[model samples]
Target: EQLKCCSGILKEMFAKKHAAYAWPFYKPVDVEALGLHDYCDIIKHPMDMSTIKSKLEAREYRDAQEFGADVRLMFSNCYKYNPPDHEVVAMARKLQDVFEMRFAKMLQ
Candidate 1:
C-alpha cells in the first residue's frame, strides 16, 4: 500500500499552469517571467515513502485503480495520452493491482 500521492503538488502545479496558460489573456503572473519551467516542476518535491503509501492506501480506491489502469493501458499502447505515445507508466501495474485486489477480488 503505497501512500505516495503527488496530487497535492500536482494540483498546485496545474493551478500554476492554468494561471500561466491564462496569463497571456487574463494578464496574471507569468511563470516563465519568474524563471519557472514546466508546471510539473512548479511544486515538485520529494515525499516520504510511508506517507505516500498511506495516502495511496487511503485514496479513493476506485479512482486510484482506474487512474492506474489508464496509465497501464496507455503504456501498453492500448490508447494514447500524448503524441508519439509517452508517459511515466511505472505506476500502472501497481494501480491495476490495487483495483484488482480492492474491487475485482482476485486476479484472472
Candidate 2:
C-alpha cells in the first residue's frame, strides 16, 4: 500500500523539479567541464532529472518504487559529492524535503 498503483505520479513529481531551484538536478554532472578531476572516483554513480525522464519515457521502470528509488539517488548523489555548506547541497535538502511530502501522497 506504500507504492503508487498508477504511473502518473512520477511525471507530476518530476515536472516540479525542473524549474529555478532545480538547475543542478536538471542535467547530469559534467565532470570534465566542472573540472572535477576525481569526480568519477568519488561520485561512483550520478543520477539526474533528465536521466530519470529518459528512463520514464523508455519505460525502464517497472513500478513507482523503482522510480522513487532513483529520485532519491539523484538527491543522495548531491549530498554525497557536495559540502554541507554548498548551495547545491542546500538546494538538494529543500528538494528532498519537498519530494518526501509528494512521495508520501504517491503511495496508495
Candidate 3:
C-alpha cells in the first residue's frame, strides 16, 4: 500500500516539517511516464474492462471472444518530478494483493 507507507511519514513530516519547518521530506511517486505505467501496459490483459466494454457494447462478440484475457501485474519504483522517496517494496505488495483479489477469478 503506497498510501500506507506515505501516510505514516506524511503525518509526522507534514506536522513538524512542512507545517512548522522546512526540513526536507521524502515522497514516492507513480506517474504515467514512469516504468510503472509501461509495465502495466505491457502486461495488461488484452481483454481488459476497457477493451471488453467497447467490444461487447458494439456487438463485436467474435472479437471479444478472440481477445481472451490475462491477469498479470505492472510495477515501478521511480518518483516523478516530485521530492525524494521512501521504500516502495511494501506498496508493490499491496498492489499485488489488490489485483489478485479483484481479478483472480478472471484469470481462471
Candidate 4:
C-alpha cells in the first residue's frame, strides 16, 4: 500500500530515457555534431522528454512492476546515466512502488 504509482513528470522522465536508449542513433539537437567533450556538457545530447511522455501515456502496461525495471535497463548500457552502482537504487525502488500502486495492485 505504501507504493506509489508512476505518472506525471516522473513517468515522463522514464519514457524519455527509454526512448533515448531504444534508439541507438538518438541524440539531442546538435549533440551528435558536438560529439564527446571533456566537460560533457558541451556534447550532452538533449532528449525530448515531452514526446516520450506522450508515447508512454498512450502505452498499455502489462506489468506495473516493469516501468522502473525497464528504466533501469534503459540506462544500463550508458555509464553516463549512472556514475555509481549504489546510488539511485532507492529512486528506482520508489519508482517501482509508484508504478505498482498506480498501474497495478500493490503487493505487500
Candidate with the greatest TM-score versus the true structure: 2
RMSD in angstroms, candidate 3?
14.1
Which portions of model 4 show Cα errors greater than 4 Å? 1-4, 8-54, 60-62, 80-107
Error of 2 at 90 (Å): 1.6
- Measured against the true structure, the TM-scores of the candidates, in listed sequence, are 0.23, 0.72, 0.23, 0.31
Ranked candidates (TM-score, high to low): 2, 4, 3, 1
Question: What's the count of clashing pairs in each model shown?
Answer: 8, 0, 1, 4
Candidate numbers, best lDDT first, in rank order:
2, 4, 1, 3
Q: What is the C-alpha lDDT of each candidate?
A: 0.38, 0.68, 0.36, 0.44
User: How does candidate 4 fare on TM-score?
Assistant: 0.31
Expressed as tens digits, the lDDT of each residue in 10-95 for candidate 4 is 54434774333324323333435765354356224333323334445677444445555545444343335434664344454444
Write one digit per residue (lDDT tens) for candidate 1, span 1-108.
222343442243246643343233232224568654553353343222232334445765444465555444433542232234333233333334544454443223
What ranges in model 3 sit over 4 Å off? Answer: 1-73, 76-86, 105-108
Which pairs of residues collide in candidate 4? 4-98, 5-98, 6-98, 28-46
lDDT against true structure, model 4: 0.44
Candidate 4, residue 3: lDDT = 25
> Where's the lowest-lDDT run of ten residues in candidate 4?
20-29
Error of 3 at 72 (Å): 4.0
Tens-digit lDDT track for model 2 on 60-94? 77777787788777677767777877877777787
Better of 2 and 4 by TM-score: 2
